[PDB]
Amino acid sequence: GSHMNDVLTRVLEVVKNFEKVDASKVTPESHFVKDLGLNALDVVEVVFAIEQEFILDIPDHDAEKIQSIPDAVEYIAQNPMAK
Amino acid sequence: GSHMNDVLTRVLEVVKNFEKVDASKVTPESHFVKDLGLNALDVVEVVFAIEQEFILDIPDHDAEKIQSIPDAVEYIAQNPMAK
DSSP: OOHHHHHHHHHHHHHHHSTTSOGGGOOTTOBTTTTTOOOHHHHHHHHHHHHHHTTOOOOHHHHTTOOBHHHHHHHHHHOTTOO | OOHHHHHHHHHHHHHHTSTTSOGGGOOTTOBTTTTTOOOHHHHHHHHHHHHHHTTOOOOHHHHTTOOBHHHHHHHHHHOSSOO
16 A cells, blocks of 8 residues: 555545535545535535544645645645644 | 554555465454464564565664564554655
């Protein structure tokens, strides 16, 4: 395995289990709006749930940059404080 | 999930897939010698496979202490260099 796959595996289950997400549409490349059709409120709560999964606090400036599962996985894997 | 479980999951598969290990006996608490019947030569090769799974070079001072799956997971999870 790998650390990047470890991160992706947990982001996938956070996003699939979110109530406003149709899990059958989720891929490792899913964009939150352009692929999963989420609105602005859904994105904020999904990103927060991703934060809780990794026991991480992301400042709002970069939390707003997270708009897809690749963005979330790329960011979380690079964060050393991740858990 | 969790970071410690991510490490544990990959250590379990390294140990289970080792040729001198009976995979059916491996748990998160397996001791290499008293539970899996490995000798010191086997343990070194298991430690090396753990080094390659996580792209870590474990100094001999810390490799000698690794005698069980808890020993390996506690060490790897705490090491900031990891993959």
